[model samples]
Target chain A: PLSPLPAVARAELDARTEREIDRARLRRADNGFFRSARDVESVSPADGHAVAVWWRQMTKAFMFTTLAGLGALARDYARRDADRELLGAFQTVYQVIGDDLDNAAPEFSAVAPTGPAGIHYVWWDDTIVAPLAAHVTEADRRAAEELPAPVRELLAAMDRLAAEPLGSAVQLRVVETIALDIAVGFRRVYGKVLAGGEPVFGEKDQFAWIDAHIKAETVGMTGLVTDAERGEEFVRLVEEYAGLWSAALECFGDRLTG
Target chain B: PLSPLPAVARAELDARTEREIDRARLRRADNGFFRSARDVESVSPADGHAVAVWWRQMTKAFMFTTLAGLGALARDYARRDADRELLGAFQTVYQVIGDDLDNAAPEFSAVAPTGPAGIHYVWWDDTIVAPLAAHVTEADRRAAEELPAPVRELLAAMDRLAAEPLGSAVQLRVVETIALDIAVGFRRVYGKVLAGGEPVFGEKDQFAWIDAHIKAETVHAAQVSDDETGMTGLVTDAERGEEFVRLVEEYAGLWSAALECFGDRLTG
Candidate 1:
């Protein structure tokens, strides 16, 4: 049989491991992905107001995505909490946040070259509600050979909006500030709270959880996003982005209609 | 204004940084977590049938969770690609994976909880999904409780399964396997692929990813687990002699269900 270590030695070993883990976590927080706000300054303006329009839309997408993620997390923890009422409140918050995101998506611009106004409809369960009566998804495309109705409406509106000179410097500055805060908040939360804790997780599980997180982060890193995209889809994307921003601007804090 | 360096210089600096990050990742993995396999030898009057059943269920959970995670990665990558067919295929694969997880989760009991099932679910989500679903913020309980009817039915089935007995011998074996595979995968992936990718990500980017992964693993290391969490809830929340294992078991059914359910989304 091997000789057993003394209690003191065991405790020392445990302490050492814990210290190492803490150090590793700190290092992770300092990783380059979030270390510097590099991407904030590199906003593209080569294609006129397209860059500005796209940024606003991206901000909305991030907002909705964040709500969805947090909502998902809340649902998991409600299973066995001591205070059931409090959990219900959080659930309402989740539903409202989802609603807010949908509302915040863009109003559509008119169809290009064609004269009629674009359709407005919900993307959920793939059909327009009775009042809106708009085409949606592929069906809408076939119906008019136009982009999704809401999206087309958005692009036409942006073309009109961007037709004017860029916003006053102060206005631009204020919008940028709001956008950055959202990005930063998402990054900060994931870095600290989300990465820590779990009733079932301890200090000694292998690195798979964190590894998976890192891979997901790297794969989606907007900072590292540089691969060129195809042309037709890219233009289509540009048009859709413009609509999203106009939507964001119009309904910054309003409840979603869709 | 400072004169800008050429692209070549930037590349050189990045390559050098990647090396340092990879080295740090390897070091962290070595010191991260260690559990003795001797626990397997301690099974009490463990019947062979009970052990086999326990082993199979636990294995299925592990396999399903792993595959589910991989499927999510594949699907997420599809978004950036222009190939519409590829995106659709990824979606299909993910949905199927999700369905499988949902199916396997209900049957995820073998009397003795093998490993940190609850923590595993949280960890898996934190890793695989950018928005980490396994953890609930104080803001999200009510919505989760009212999961659609089908999901609630699944949850009820899971609770029933958790109360069943898993024989001692097989439970021990599952624990041993968890420790072994986790360690092997960590060392191999961390030291080799992630660490090896230094040339692509400068040292800082690479290490950040590694450190994040390590921290997540550490939480799994220090989780609280228990075996006697009855359907009604623990009468005594006192720490048992097997405090860690008990805590791990207490959440096993819930965790397994979450993991399997998460897998369903990806496989779908």
Candidate 2:
């Protein structure tokens, strides 16, 4: 028995309300499920740039942690040739990525891979999904068009690694180690984002405050990377994969801090 | 704390006990979670399976309850298409699928679509995510292979349903409804499974039980039915479309019984 609002005014009102409602609902639902920060709000354009910075930092941490883990294992296992060589390369690539991050431009935060290891932890959620989810529907197209190119490069790296013939145990252990580090990075930034307060990233009551802004987006567990055209599943997959990886690493993570 | 058993035979027993204690302490902490379910003395496998049958029956009863809720809704809606030819078909199908208890065959027990849908009403938990997990390890493969085939079919049906063109609102409703049904189903089965004081499913806890079975079966929701694979998503769209026609006729029959049944129960 509710009366209808006029069509013209209703369209604008509905669109704006839809965006706000989604944000509010997400905030209420996303509280402290995983390692999350406190007291954050919605992501604004200014926060966009900050998220880019965070992503670079997180990816670097992931690479360093991964290489460190692999190297330690190689040493302990007394692997003399290929294992040692591979571990060294991992360390070096992590460094290369780190170097690139320092030099990467500020404006294209989404594309830049910065920090101790330059590997871009590009999956999709923190990078694309959160922002898109944060925006009004009218802005969706523009937001997608602005997706950083670095996402593709990172995806290519994943493809390359996947196609290679590494030993099953070695590959799994390394991926698991990397995934754990990525989780830690999220935990760290979630702390900071929560500390920063609202209208920027998120509010005190909800989780997306911090979750929305983490730059180095990762979807490690289920292998669902984001696609501008077809990335919803990818985001879900990444979340799934990360959780899966986390479970595996929990058993052995303490022994492989690098 | 007492002095190690004094006599010769007793000493031997004491040493074995000490060794076991040490093994338990030194064993990997990642026994994942919970103390081992195997440690409880005298939990027999056959006795456990017998109890599961009852749990399954109870689960079906609950499943019928929820489906009946949906049927009532469908019946009310059918009146809108009261004169259609398919009214009878819709009514008949709903009856066959919703109320008829014996229609839920044991062969169809674990199967996705065929299972009374009640089985799932309570099946959610970690088991839902197991299949997407890494392939079963070598030690667990045999146990997985023994699962009933009907379970596999139903899983396929679920996948197909998930893949349907339900917009987000419909999709959310579907997942919510399924989850609610599952929660109830879990409670029903847990009671019976706990009675023989052993698990009916191989899981130690309900959540773990779900995770183990779901993983072992590994059915995807979106791919439940592939017409090419003889996995019927449901009867053909055209046939399903006829359900509107069939439903109209069934309402008259139902209304008559409902009126009589209500009066009889109330008057007595």
Candidate 3:
């Protein structure tokens, strides 16, 4: 239901985001966090180098869970539209984005589906794959026990935002900010992975599709996103994510690595 | 997306099948499932009269889980009208149906949240109430360990039908048949509680809504409209028509085992 943002408004806001990340030094092609990590796992735990990846994973899990809720919220919001194309993008996420992550990181496939790591693998299948085919139901202590406390707390904070109402212009603007953040985060980490000449998603090359499609949907929301003063709070979103990223570092602070 | 059953070849099949249950004795009001039951939680385990409330608990939980799958499946098969309406019905099961059951059945609430009964309650919340907001992250043993083996096996079979593709007519029909059979099963057992002057689902008259809903649903439940069988028609046009037909027959057959355990806990 968000009409695309006013043209000049979108360009200025998009350009501002670009400049801010540049200033943060988050985009250094030579020194970026993901510049040299060999596998998804080495980069997965809690460490200085792992902070950004953890942030990314935390957001990744949070976003995956929340998007369904946001879609439902937006649908229930006055029974709205502009519903067609944007929601089309939602369907793709269900099959593509996380799926691509699983395929590209066959590194994860090597982990036995046993203890903590194994339980996480099973939990993901239980949640993301067809629940009808799930081997573990969500209530199993075996599944809940998989995450460290920091991981759960970090995901909880990111998830709290998803529960917000998108019923008005300001609230809808808030939801759009999340889309912008997801767009930015995916590009920063995932984009870097592919730049290495690595086939990030192996046979399917989902990064190729995600790279193109998700960005299209991101810009698709620009018009509505900059429609209000709350749009300015996107800078605030940056601060909060930095906090979450730091928290991700704590999740691995005491880990016993295999 | 489902091509939607060919428009010209649809309704007659939907009509005949709808009527078949009429003579199936599954629809007889005189010999009802809820003719009597002394209480929701009787002291003794073996009471032939206890059948009514126990059956009620089993199907409420049964309908609760399958409703989610059907909603999500219909969601993907979005071309048809039944998908959205029926999908909303699934949500109502969460917001309305399950809540009323929790509130009305204090006998269940009185059981320790630690036993299998309590486990079933918590799992309901874990799975249906707030999966996104759930505490048991699909890996928790505390929850899984509590479910009886039969309960696990039975739930797994009913859930199997969700895996079939919605693309071909046959899978689509298989999906529709699941919905229709559920709708029929619900009306047969749950509907009978409302058949008598006595109140079931408490004095709030919650049964009135379920009564109207299943009635509206039975005729128009999974179908698209007067002109189309919606899912029912999709079943007719399903490829290898016999495969889709017989497949649901097999799964619905397993549903009884689920019911038997509800009785076995008491009767055996």
Candidate 4:
């Protein structure tokens, strides 16, 4: 049995750990994922559409991967605890949430206006539930294939984890990894959004960046990405992920007894 | 490579699949998780507090399990796709969301007001962050132990799957599992809330259910569950979990075509 330490002590320990982690998160963050210097330098001035497509893939990947993980762990917990009356209620917690996140994944994956001439990718701005609901699967296969990389490394690790033990610690590890991945990854992601002097993640540049992709019309084979006239789409995209980080930080800090 | 399904065709196929699943789901759902003839019958009229504690543990389990799953899968997808540029953001997508769901899980596992004469368990109603943050670990140790069952059977199956491939199939499986778990589980869950009555999940009875737990104070060792004048704490709790089921149902039907996108792509 994992003995619970005193609340105050546990609180302090966790709080300190989170503070240090966030503090150090910046230093080593440059190695992999979003923006290693190499990725952003020359290649960043690449196509804005490519970056957006890639971002879409990344978002879809996170949604799928996380949903799978949540479902499995939820099952594991239910099993460990079991048939003990409350199990079902607990089990549903993951299912519904799993579904909730899953709901968002498709929003990322299959775009509609269905291809070649029109492709709509919108989140935090508009609901294409109608378009999405009416999505064409014929195009989806190509879109998924066209989706450069669904973060192969990210996907691979989770694959391995699925075969590992059911521990909440893995969730912690996964988040920690992402915290850095995005930090470095951001370098690549943001820069690629614009082919300008130097792309900034601030509000100032996002529109042009959106227009750039809107101009590029992302999927050459699939189609074009014209703005339905939305601003912070990319910003919200990044913000969604940022939301993830803050969520962990909030709880880790809030739940501690110190 | 999987052929591109027509938008219309894909939509119809997924819609058909979901309608069918929900249909067949009712048949076998009787076997596990939430309810069976044996689970809800005579035993259901038990105490409301125990049921509440169990539900809290279940919610906690879901939160932790899903967060871990999302984190792991997010990493896996990132790895599979490689420093593919968009990865970190995608990865962070999972991290942040993972963090989000995990945020809710801890709320389930730990409670405060420091046990005995005071065990505050609240959600969707109030901010227990302060109480939770200030909770006594010593009391928590006893509380976790006294936490009856954290759904051991449910936990074990997930552990087994963990050693399996990281397939979205598992997520589908997980939701399918919970959907039934709740359908059956609700019988016992609602029953125990009121002594001699078939407790309805509607608002009328929920206040009594909360009051009953407040009356039983679920965790005797950890202490009591008295009302601080709040209502629907348990209702919100159940509602939150229910959201998971509907979410799955909504997406599964909606996204089967979406699933087809990465169908061939997910690496083992």
Candidate 5:
């Protein structure tokens, strides 16, 4: 119901948008997931290309938050007494995030082998996913307290995994890639129609605002590095949560192809 | 905190999960978006493999709903007053779904070209992204009525584009592929530990329930099909052609990689 666009201008925008979409599709189809030891080297931005690093780091932060979100969902699924559909969805999440994490680890490590860890945290919302979250009984808390030493060791590894490059790296790469993808589309559209030294596409002001928002949101989580022993009790609790996930996966493997 | 997993069972499950994850990663990284004329044929399940077709159809159904969802989002963005973020998100969506649609059109045309098209519809949600939906004022409705003929035609084209196979095919393939990918993961674990000629993994009953759910959801949108007249309205207009193509490509690509990720798992 908007006014008619100048046919020429519309065509111009369309061409750029189409090309960008194709590139994004190709990129999405790329199998950049698995990392061999040889591929573990970090990526450094070019001498004057700090923005790429910033974008990558921002992506890493987002990936971590996404993973944490998925992990919470997985835990919730574990506690749920639901049928296969919900469980299948949860398994799909695990499959997707696990692959995402595996793919992200090396790039993240290469880009940021050791940065300020544990800079941000996202608390799981207990009120949400009520059926799943509500299943965390008192017995579950006691069961966490009684975890065997070896099981505790695995928990510790997961904690370090979360605290160090694993979680953040996943966040960084996914976010960076997505951001860069958006950057490509935005640049195309902006350059085609709104590039004539004006604030038309909100490039000068709105773009800057968005850029600042990304940086702020990502940086806030910079202090959230995992401290396995520091949050030992919490770690144990999460492990208990993971234990339920494992059980659910076991019980419902047929339903979940992922 | 939970009771200890038996070491052997734990190790076994861990091993299976690890391999499946690895395969999944490799599959995700593959570039499977573009479809060739020769590859546009309908997928036939391997001999005696009804489950594969069922999964594929189910996925096709999911693809439609997801497309409708994205289309709704696109329309919402289309009607919005100027905002950089929503516009950016809209463009991103265009890039993804457009790619997906570009890849899907030939295949869908090849598979079910000229089928009865208007079987399904997805109602736009008004509550989300308050600004655009909020702008559904009486004035706005009046403005829609006052739109110029060419502009009205263009909007009509966009509407058909959203309702067509162009939108749903991309969704179907992407969703189907994901289902299959998970099927691999499911198959691995179920076969290794849970499958012993029994219903431990809920294969007998639960699987059917999930299947039924997929069918019901997808069939609801069975009426969607591309409109040649609508396509012509936009495409014959040299300026609007690219725009129309851009929209389709953006929507189609959104789910293509997701489908590819799933497809890769199924094959790998």
Candidate 6:
């Protein structure tokens, strides 16, 4: 039998967990780097503007692919007859979150992209969502592809918005704030809250629910993620993202100093 | 930064986790008390039939209450604006599961309970579901009370089925097998599959997701749950975590006479 944690020890754990949660919230605050374009602008305005634009683009980018991946994984897991109901339930949860995000992002972006934005949409579709979406089971893929007219329209608008750039420093900052809120919201919900060991309803034990889902999906690909080519690509993307800011810093170097 | 777990250590952890899952699955299987009313009855045939009838009544009893509790918790948690979307998603998931079970239970139970079945239904409801449901928030209670007509009809049928007694040992054993199958099926899904650590697409780490949800919900109640009474309940529940098994053992003890009545019919 598992012994109850000592009262003092339990109190300490509770305090520590609360502190961690507090930190996550703070990191997501407006002045927080992840949340604050002004914080980025203070160091490099050009970087701030560029980052805000990048974030507006990436938020939709990351959200959809992640949502798609979740749906795909749930569908794959649902193949067994016994697992269908629970896994179907799991997929429905992800779908609800996905649908919410699809609506939520546009309210923040406020403007539509140009007609020529088709190219950028195609690139992101092919590079990100498609790579993972390709892995979705055939039946699930067909269902996911056949979105309702309104859903399709919303997705198309989101895709176009992803192609659009925030024009002003203030607008960029607002996007930056929203972007940080979404990211930090995920970390708060998925990283800190769900992963922590606390009692809820009748469940007493704390275990990784989403992490377990991820582990189940990647059992075979553990080595692939750490391979030399992937590592090189990973490093390259980091440098590329950094390089954008570095170039902006060079171009606007005199503005901050002057 | 958290260091990557070394390959050997990762393998060992995975193996250990898998073993725990397998053991849980086995324990919930036939011969495992939860899945084996026949196993229970093998010790005493009369006990088996009674156990079987009891199992049929209880599965619906346990499944719905648990589903209701999940939805109620999600609804209560949804009160804060920030939690609405996520908690809403959680509630939807529970609703889906609830709907599935509501339909599935009757297909197995098949027969309706007698008019006098109210007492057994009330006993299980009071002993099990009501205790946890009592903890649900008031606002959620009002919403839950208004379950849709179809859902209400299903519950009514289940309620009637709960009142019925097994006529003979053979019928009881058949019910026992089906009940055990459902019990074991849930253990396999919720306990084994959901709990297992596996990498899925888009998720890179497998240690933080559900734990975070637990942390979020219990942020305030953390200290309360660690106190003496709370700790005692925690330890006791943990000791007998095979809740279905514990439930049957308790029910069998309390309702032996009911079983004796059916057993008498078999001999007569």
Per-residue alpha-carbon lDDT of candidate 1 for residues B1-268, written as tens digits (9 for 90 to 100): 2111233442333233234323322222322221111112221111211222222333334433333222222222212221222222222222222222222122222221222222233223222221212223434433333343434443443333222221111122122223333433322332222112232222443233234334333322221111111111111122321332343343333333433332232223
Instruction: Evaluate candidate 2 and give its CAPRI docking class based on DockQ.
Output: incorrect
Pick out the ten consecutive residues of candidate 5 chain A with the lowest summed lDDT: A118-127
Tens-digit lDDT track of model 3 for A1-258: 543346687677666655544444333242223233212332221122233333334534443333323333333321222332333332233222222222212333343232222222233332222221232345542343356566666566545544332212222233333443443433443333331344232333333323433444444323335244534655445445434433443344333132
Tens-digit lDDT string for candidate 1 (A1-258): 111133454344334433432332322243232333222322111111122223323333333233323322222232332122332332233222222222211211111111111111112101112111221244432333223344345434333322111111111222222333334422332222111133111222222223322333243001111122222222233234433443443331121111
How far residue A13's Cα lies from its native spot in candidate 4, in Å, is 5.4
Lowest lDDT block of 10, candidate 4 chain A = A220-229
Cα miss at B129, model 2 (Å)?
Answer: 19
Candidate 3 regions off by >4 Å? A1-258, B7-9, B12-25, B29-154, B166-229, B233-237, B256-268
lDDT of 6 by residue, A41-91 (tens): 232222222222333244333333333333232222221222222323332
lDDT of candidate 2 over A1-258, digit per residue (tens): 212233454354434433432332222232232222222332233333334443433343333333322223222222111222233333233222222223222322333333211113332334433543444344543543342334333323333332122211222333433433344444443333321343323444233322322323233111111122222323333333334333322212221221
Instruction: Give a tens-digit lDDT track for model 6, residues B9-94.
Output: 43343344234334333223422343332222222222222333343344434333333333222222222122222322332332
TM-score of chain A of each: 0.22, 0.27, 0.43, 0.37, 0.26, 0.29
Task: List DockQ for all candidates.
Answer: 0.02, 0.01, 0.02, 0.12, 0.01, 0.02
Compute the interface RMSD for candidate 6: 16.3
Tell me, by DockQ, which candidate is best. Answer: 4
Q: Lowest-scoring 10 consecutive residues by lDDT in candidate 6 chain A?
A: A163-172
On residues A91-123, what C-alpha lDDT tens digit does candidate 4 reach at each position? Answer: 333333332232222322233221111212223
Best-fitting candidate, measured by TM-score?
4
Candidates' interface RMSDs, in order?
12.6, 28.3, 17.0, 10.3, 16.9, 16.3
Model 1 DockQ reads 0.02
Q: Please provide, for model 2 over B74-93, each residue's C-alpha lDDT reduced to its tens digit, 9 standing for 90 to 100.
A: 22321222221122222222
- Ranked by TM-score, the better of candidates 1 and 3 is 3
lDDT of 3 by residue, B46-80 (tens): 12213332333334334333333333332333222
Cα displacement (angstroms), candidate 5, residue A120, comes to: 47
Per-residue lDDT tens digits for candidate 4, residues B1-268, read: 1112233433343344345446434323422332232243433222333334444554444444444444444444434433222222222333222322332223322332211112122231122122222333545434533533224444434344333222222333334333333323433444433333543343533333233323222222111111210110111123332433343354333222222211111111
